[PDB]
Scaffold this active site. Sequence first.
Site, short mmCIF file in Angstrom:
data_model
loop_
_atom_site.label_atom_id
_atom_site.label_comp_id
_atom_site.label_asym_id
_atom_site.label_seq_id
_atom_site.Cartn_x
_atom_site.Cartn_y
_atom_site.Cartn_z
N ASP A 111 -31.43 20.29 -4.59
CA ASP A 111 -30.75 20.00 -3.34
C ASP A 111 -31.77 19.46 -2.34
OD1 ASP A 111 -29.37 20.21 -0.75
OD2 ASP A 111 -27.95 21.61 -1.66
N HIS A 119 -19.45 14.26 -5.15
CA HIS A 119 -20.00 14.57 -3.84
C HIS A 119 -20.90 13.43 -3.38
CE1 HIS A 119 -21.52 16.77 -0.42
NE2 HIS A 119 -22.73 16.76 -0.94
C1 HEM Z 1 -21.20 22.98 0.31
C2 HEM Z 1 -22.48 22.82 0.65
C3 HEM Z 1 -23.18 21.67 0.06
C4 HEM Z 1 -23.89 21.65 -1.10
C5 HEM Z 1 -24.11 22.83 -2.02
C6 HEM Z 1 -24.37 20.32 -1.26
C7 HEM Z 1 -25.14 19.96 -2.37
C8 HEM Z 1 -25.67 18.70 -2.53
C9 HEM Z 1 -26.42 18.29 -3.66
C10 HEM Z 1 -26.77 19.16 -4.85
C11 HEM Z 1 -26.77 16.98 -3.46
C12 HEM Z 1 -27.57 16.11 -4.41
C13 HEM Z 1 -29.09 16.23 -4.24
C14 HEM Z 1 -29.53 15.57 -2.95
O1 HEM Z 1 -29.66 14.32 -2.88
O2 HEM Z 1 -29.76 16.29 -1.95
C15 HEM Z 1 -26.21 16.58 -2.21
C16 HEM Z 1 -26.37 15.33 -1.65
C17 HEM Z 1 -25.87 15.03 -0.38
N1 HEM Z 1 -25.06 15.78 0.40
FE1 HEM Z 1 -24.41 17.51 0.00
N2 HEM Z 1 -23.96 19.55 -0.25
C18 HEM Z 1 -23.24 20.29 0.61
C19 HEM Z 1 -22.61 19.93 1.81
C20 HEM Z 1 -22.73 18.67 2.38
C21 HEM Z 1 -22.03 18.21 3.51
C22 HEM Z 1 -21.03 19.00 4.32
C23 HEM Z 1 -22.45 16.90 3.75
C24 HEM Z 1 -22.01 15.96 4.81
C25 HEM Z 1 -21.93 16.30 6.09
C26 HEM Z 1 -23.40 16.59 2.72
C27 HEM Z 1 -24.05 15.40 2.62
C28 HEM Z 1 -24.83 15.06 1.52
C29 HEM Z 1 -25.53 13.77 1.46
C30 HEM Z 1 -25.52 12.67 2.51
C31 HEM Z 1 -26.17 13.75 0.28
C32 HEM Z 1 -27.02 12.61 -0.25
C33 HEM Z 1 -26.11 11.43 -0.61
C34 HEM Z 1 -26.93 10.35 -1.26
O3 HEM Z 1 -27.22 10.44 -2.48
O4 HEM Z 1 -27.32 9.37 -0.59
N3 HEM Z 1 -23.54 17.68 1.90
N4 HEM Z 1 -25.53 17.65 -1.66
#
Ligand code: HEM
Lengths: 306, 304, 306, 305, 306, 306
Positions: D145, D218
Amino acid sequence: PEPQMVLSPLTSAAIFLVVTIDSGGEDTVRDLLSDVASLERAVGFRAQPDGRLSCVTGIGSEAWDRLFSGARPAGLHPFRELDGPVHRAVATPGDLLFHIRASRLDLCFALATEIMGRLRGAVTPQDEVHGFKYFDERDMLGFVDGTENPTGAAARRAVLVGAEDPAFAGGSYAVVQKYLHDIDAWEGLSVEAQERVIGRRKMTDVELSDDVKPADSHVALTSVTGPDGSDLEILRDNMPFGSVGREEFGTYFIGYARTPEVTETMLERMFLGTASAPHDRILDFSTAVTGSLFFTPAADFLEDLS
Amino acid sequence: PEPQMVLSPLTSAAIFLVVTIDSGGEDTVRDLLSDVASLERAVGFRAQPDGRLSCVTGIGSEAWDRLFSGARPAGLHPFRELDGPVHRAVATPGDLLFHIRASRLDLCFALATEIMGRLRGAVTPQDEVHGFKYFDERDMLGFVDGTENPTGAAARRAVLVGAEDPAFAGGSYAVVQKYLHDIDAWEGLSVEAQERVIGRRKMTDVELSDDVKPADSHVALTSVTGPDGSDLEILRDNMPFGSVGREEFGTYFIGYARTPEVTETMLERMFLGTASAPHDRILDFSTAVTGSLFFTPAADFLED
Amino acid sequence: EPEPQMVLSPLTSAAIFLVVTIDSGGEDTVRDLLSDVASLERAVGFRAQPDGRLSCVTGIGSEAWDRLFSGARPAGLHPFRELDGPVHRAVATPGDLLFHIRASRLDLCFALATEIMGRLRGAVTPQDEVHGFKYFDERDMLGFVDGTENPTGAAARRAVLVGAEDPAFAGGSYAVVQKYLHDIDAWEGLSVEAQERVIGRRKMTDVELSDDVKPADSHVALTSVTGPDGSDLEILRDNMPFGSVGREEFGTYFIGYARTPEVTETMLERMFLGTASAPHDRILDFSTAVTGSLFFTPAADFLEDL
Amino acid sequence: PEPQMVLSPLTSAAIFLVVTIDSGGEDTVRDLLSDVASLERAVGFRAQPDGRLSCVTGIGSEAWDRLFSGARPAGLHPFRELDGPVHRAVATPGDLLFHIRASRLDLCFALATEIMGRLRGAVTPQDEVHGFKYFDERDMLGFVDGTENPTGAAARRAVLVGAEDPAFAGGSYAVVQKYLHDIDAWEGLSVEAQERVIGRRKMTDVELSDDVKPADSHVALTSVTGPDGSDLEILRDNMPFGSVGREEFGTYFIGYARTPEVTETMLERMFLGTASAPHDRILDFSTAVTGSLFFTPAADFLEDL
Amino acid sequence: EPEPQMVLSPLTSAAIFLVVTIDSGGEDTVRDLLSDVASLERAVGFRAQPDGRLSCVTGIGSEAWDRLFSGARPAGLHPFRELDGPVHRAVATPGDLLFHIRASRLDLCFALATEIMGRLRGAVTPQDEVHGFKYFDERDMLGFVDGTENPTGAAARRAVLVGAEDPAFAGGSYAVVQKYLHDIDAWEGLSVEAQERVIGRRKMTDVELSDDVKPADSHVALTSVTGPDGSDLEILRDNMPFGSVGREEFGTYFIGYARTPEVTETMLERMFLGTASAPHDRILDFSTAVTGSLFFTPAADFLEDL
Amino acid sequence: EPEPQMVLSPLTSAAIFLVVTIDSGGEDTVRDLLSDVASLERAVGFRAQPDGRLSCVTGIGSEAWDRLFSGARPAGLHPFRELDGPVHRAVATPGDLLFHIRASRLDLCFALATEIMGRLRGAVTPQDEVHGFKYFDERDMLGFVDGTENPTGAAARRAVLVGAEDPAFAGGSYAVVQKYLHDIDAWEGLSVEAQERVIGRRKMTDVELSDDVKPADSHVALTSVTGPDGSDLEILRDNMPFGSVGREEFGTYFIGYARTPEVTETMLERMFLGTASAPHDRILDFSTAVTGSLFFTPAADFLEDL
Ligand code: HEM
Ligand code: HEM
Ligand code: HEM
Ligand code: HEM
Ligand code: HEM
């Protein structure tokens, strides 16, 4: 416009060398000044990145007129002595400053050896101090030392000479003073009494509030606002040193500043006192035995010699 | 029988404290001795586990007689001066040794301060050395120092007094010498010449083969075998010390053994030489300016 | 402000050099990988921060560039030039793409290498693969500290990164690679002082030999070049020892970056062809070049828009 | 203008503190804001360099009007509820945010104790969460993450307010959401199906090719382009937290952007969907139970009180 | 030579304390977990070596022993004996199973905790969950260094592990846990000198007060016990700060290990009941016990073989 | 009393395996090396303390033992037994000496291997040379955490070191080597669950599969063995990933120490020949052994008296 490693990462060993230039030795000194950077690397590279070896080179006011014939930095003068009612800040000889810092002392020593090897016959050592930090950034008084140092961009602006003296931008002015402590008198004080002397909590390093902070405390007297209500800061890298057998327990003060006037103001307030404060209480447990002022030129000023 | 931390892991910093007991200071010293162990705990504990802070406390021959009564350690005597043709091993006063070692110089200093604060008015400082090691385990001559030290069970058998003196089992004999080096003369030699002085390669730290290694090299002379063909060994913890301003560059020698016999043979063989060798060539670039012998008792002996 | 690749990487203890030619047809596969390489770097690298220090610099050759991109070419992009010296030869071997992969651990390099090659299966033919390990004290295969006199900070940036001279390819750089094979038998038959005369620096202490004892044909003497003005021209090296003990193969992988290949090319000319003062570089009497290729390494932005 | 420690090096522990300011506690709070950085130094200095202790102070839309008159930051508004066909992003009270980070949780707690010490009797606690990050940087769902967070200069431009709102340059907008996961359901999926949910391989953290990646994954729904065609990015520092006894297994979402629009747009796509995707598949295993928005000013703003 | 559990852990900085009661029917499930507990430790720990230092010590209560195991019962296994002191109470609270999980980081504890509690769902009811954290210089919630006088090595083993005197359960240990809530406000009201006299050690330097300067109602005094022969009765403790800054919870989690429970119990009697010289332990005026439980922690051999 | 070689080494993340046969007439040179192998270990290793953790384990083959020493033979020493199974084959390959070199850095491994072979050239012939690196999370080339169930401490000594059953060779060990090459392409066409059913553990969390779900032909199932007395029979492994992305070589280097080679061979038989309930080990459907040797690794002092 590239400065020396004035803004060093936290180091835990340091060597302070202070030397006077013997008559006739001017050429030998100039030869070394141009190689100091090369010797830094010669010693430091093979320990990188964990060694963090850096040597800052300072030149005294009188020494400057001997070495260079061009323009002088605007702030460079001999250390000003301070005959306070009670406490005296002495001026001692010293033409060159070698402020050497590293994670381990041997890297300091190695480089110290190299420099002096060249300078043999040309200079006379005045002071040599092997400093060490107390694992929790504490000084000999057992208080945390360096909490309020400026960092990041505040550091750059507080320390490096700029457009106000454009021929010497990237430089800094360094003031060194060797303090000896009366650990006896000091440890005979209550921990709360000590806190009044410094102006901060001993264990938690939390600043006393203004309701409580006495006016003759160290932090009260070194707190300075300028003609425009904004804080005048210096960059300190105090190092403990001493000798158990000889009963010597010291703080080696070294403060960097954009201009000597900032650190001179603080010094006056400490020694000559002010309105409410006769002197900085820290001085009733701290005798300065040395005192010198140095200009630390930009790295390329040194490079562009021989 | 619990020994002191004579077998320390590798430490980068050290302080060597040598003191004499002032006349009528015996009682103050005894109190301190039954406390050293607990000051060690107090100072070093909150810097663990990276601290590796250890003090080892030694007692000179004369000081022992003033401090205690009854049976004495079999081999405890004052350091034997050696008057060789060229070189001399001098004996200098010293009643107590404090060998303090940590990963950090400030832990050593904190512990030295405590100890010294409680001995104040009862002792006179004789020698104080603040020691650092080079990052690659080299000494002031630029050679790796400590390679052929014994490890584990080999060291234990070589340093700890056992059944040959049952009353003093768990103890050790420590010999200290402060050596100053004529660095100027040293760096006059080439690498190969310097290698023929030590008996090992400078860069690689490999022992010279037998058909090359001079009979007067340091490693040739300090290699002693006993009558059963066993290697006689000591534990060294040489620390460089110096003052750049005064052109003082030294090695602080400390050697630990179960009997002074071993260390002393090596000393004789170095200063007075053998049938092949006049003296140890390392002495041609090293002056001994201190010399003292201590018994480092078991820890449980101090806690009485 | 264009973001360059990790040309200026922190010190790393491990490297994989991977050199490939593009098989015919494989263009669009390469074109897809080039745009995803930054991403792959993060994928393999992120979960091992900050100890990992994983990076990958991606380089493109002269002849492959015409196969890959319609548009403008980097000003100084051409095939590596053979140098036929009286004694020593600098060979030119084929290479379309470079992957210079650096980490604190061989495994992080290998996982990134595995990922990159996995995407390129059937589009490329491997020419060279080198797993390199730096010695603990930053020394090379010859036992000398290697990297001491590399530029740092703003010096490194101005020395390696393309700027206004070629505004289209700003933040780019030029990499010259050479696999060297050493004659360790011969080298160890020299005395330390002899080896010192070959390199131009003291072995143990890594101090430059003084200008007056430094032989004209030493490595350091011949690789020091001054500019039009007399600004010493600089390159950024990251030499890596590599080896196979059973094949008796003791090697140094040379890679050097500059803003223009001409700086590097000058140095190679002087090493291999000699000057009026020097027959050739003495280091070549113990080193054989078995590869030689040249690559332009574009800024990260360039790779992302494909 | 010196900003707050929004761009922290990686930290392994954190405390999130959300409070509301009771009636008449305005002055107590203002005194804190002006001391907060010196408390950070006081607790953190002697732990350097390992410590990596830092605190980011955010202020909500409600509290801003009570605490300061004059200009308000351009983008500062109350968090907006999203009522999807299936999923709901709730709004919950919160006037002050303390985002406290370090390599060790004790440093966090030490700082938090100081802050609340000064605030005793002036503020009511709305939420307190002690976060930890797994050693390979994985979150509660088991996936690395924070991989695609911008770094260096890209981060500066995405996170820090500049010329568009010049009186607040160096400030930032922090959005916060406490998520509680259904681990039982989640662990029922195979690895492959989980990757379909996230957008990336579990072990290797390689992204799924656009050729394969689902449109309701996601990664798909949080990938946003602008009119400039440029990617629109936020900075995250998601933190696992929970209690094995109460079966509370969570992620604490914190996201920083130079404008709330970016974060809100990402939220919109996740909760209300697109034409292709009904909702973000991550929500089928994640429930938001808090939701608040803060402006984290430049440091020198807080210092000048 | 039976292998004990990891009662003797390297210094660890994080901990989860798990106390559960076994539900109606839960014997079979519990017995399964107990047989798999050591391998779960390895499953979570191994891939984090060596920095992890993850370990779990498993304890069984007195009432629980008889529900789980037909046959021999450990000599000193019995329910926690409540002490109704004139002023302070040491309470007893339910607990059948103890899981003392320690590591260098919290996440590793939690992961193991999730795995254990996962296998146990439906079979047990949680009584207490504590997430502990030690300060960076081994200080507790009262700002004193905590652990100094713990035994180490051959001393600790003799002090902690069951031997000849109960041959069947040799390599086992007796754990006593109590949750303490502090009145920090009362404490931080005292001077450092006052506090030092409550503990019997110097605050900053952690130096023990001299025997005749140390109060008799001090903590060090009251918990220094000589057995029959004038040798110190020792225990091994690993107290963990815990709390919550919203609910104003600031606590020590006390855990003590001994060869026999009688030692810990004698120490508890002296703290809560007092002596001839002292009314009660002065630390108790700043500390309230809210839980109290006794467990036997068997040898790993025992758990493995069922 | 008898001191072993560093079989029970801590965790190292780099290794070099060297297998050589002894040339006709080379026996004398070999004996001289064996007596010095410890000197060279200290010579390369000491300066890198404490981090380097350099160690060398020398092993000798059955046929080589006969040539090198007259006198009694380790009771269990014999040439590696070829296993010609119905599907898979465990080939035996020549090897007289094994150098198992481990450190935290590959460069330290290389420096020792250089020294050993430098003394050996003209006397031995290289059969195999493998440079090993471990993934940061202790994963093998198959992506499974590797080494989880290895014994530690006393248990590891009982399993590894020859004791009183062969008193002359007390403190020695038996090592079995096999160089495996994996079909990564095939392995990656399996779901994680299918892969899990091959190994017998969960991929991410490394939790052993429950006895209900774990197939009888899984790797863990077939390498679990109880002796005629019902106790688990253990070996110490130190599997090291190796390979070359250019040539598509993805390997596991297998080394297993036991106090008797019978334990290992029991496991090899079950892997290659299978049982009633298992045709063979499913791991072998993705792994090919290219080498196979067995060496005795003597006590350190055995080699010292040559
Ligand atoms: C439920 C809680 C959340 C979890 C467990 C979660 C988990 C993750 C994981 C595992 C990744 C992929 C690894 C990374 O690039 O960081 C990711 C990417 C991302 N998450 Fe989430 N996330 C959560 C909530 C959110 C929310 C609410 C948002 C938006 C407001 C968000 C925005 C993003 C963005 C922008 C990316 C990167 C997108 C890209 O590849 O350019 N996340 N998240
Ligand atoms: C001038 C101060 C001294 C220096 C700089 C010095 C330095 C060295 C060096 C570099 C070595 C080789 C590497 C190693 O430590 O194994 C060595 C070996 C040794 N030294 Fe010294 N030494 C000094 C004085 C002494 C003295 C006074 C003794 C004994 C009385 C001694 C006993 C030994 C022994 C026993 C060895 C190892 C012999 C072997 O290789 O088997 N040293 N010393
Ligand atoms: C055979 C492989 C090579 C080895 C082992 C080698 C080794 C070294 C060493 C030991 C130094 C001195 C330490 C330092 O400043 O980094 C050095 C310096 C240098 N080398 Fe090399 N080198 C090699 C090939 C090359 C090549 C092919 C070039 C240029 C095309 C080159 C350019 C330089 C430069 C520019 C310096 C710094 C000169 C200065 O002191 O200002 N090297 N090299
Ligand atoms: C309120 C929770 C407690 C706190 C905060 C606490 C704190 C401390 C501190 C600061 C020390 C001195 C430094 C050290 O040796 O570790 C200490 C020592 C000790 N404590 Fe406690 N303690 C607590 C409860 C207990 C209990 C309940 C026992 C016994 C059942 C106990 C037994 C000891 C012992 C045996 C020592 C060392 C004795 C010696 O000096 O020889 N403590 N404790
Ligand atoms: C193809 C090369 C091999 C690979 C990739 C491999 C991989 C693994 C893995 C991933 C594990 C489970 C984690 C662990 O406990 O270490 C394991 C366990 C094990 N392997 Fe292997 N292995 C290989 C060859 C062998 C061979 C040839 C043997 C026996 C001669 C062997 C004996 C064992 C044993 C005894 C265990 C532990 C079983 C237990 O849980 O008690 N391995 N191996």
